[PDB]
């Protein structure tokens, strides 16, 4: 289970899921305007469903499927 943090491995190759992810947290962070949220969103290498939480604040809650497999890519070496 998720018990690490920013424990990525592909965040070096991705260079896309990150910029987007981290950016996805910002958006949501605004919805609630909570400082203790952005992190979670892109905390444990973005592996904690914390993505759906923010993705929801954007009604999107759809790009999670593709955003999910992505978070898994960063776990390549990991």
From Swiss-Prot:
It comes from the Eukaryota. One of its GO terms (cellular component) is extracellular region. It is found in: Secreted. Produced by the medulla terminalis X-organ in the eyestalks and transported to the sinus gland where it is stored and released. Keywords: Disulfide bond, Hormone, Neuropeptide, Secreted, Signal. GO terms for molecular function: neuropeptide hormone activity. One of its GO terms (biological process) is circadian rhythm. Inhibits Y-organs where molting hormone (ecdysteroid) is secreted. A molting cycle is initiated when MIH secretion diminishes or stops. Has little or no hyperglycemic activity. Belongs to the arthropod CHH/MIH/GIH/VIH hormone family. This is Molt-inhibiting hormone. It comes from Penaeus japonicus (Kuruma prawn). The lineage of its organism: Eukaryota, Metazoa, Ecdysozoa, Arthropoda, Crustacea. The chain holds residues 28 to 105 of 105 of the full protein.
């Amino acid at each position: 289970a998720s018990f690490i943090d920013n424990t990525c491995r592909g965040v070096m190759g991705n260079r896309d899921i990150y910029k987007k992810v981290v950016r996805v947290c910002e958006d949501c962070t605004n919805i609630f305007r909570l400082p203790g949220l952005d992190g979670m969103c892109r905390n444990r290498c973005f592996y904690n469903e914390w993505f759906l939480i923010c993705l929801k604040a954007a009604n999107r809650e759809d790009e999670i499927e593709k955003f999910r497999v992505w978070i898994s890519i960063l776990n390549a070496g990991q």
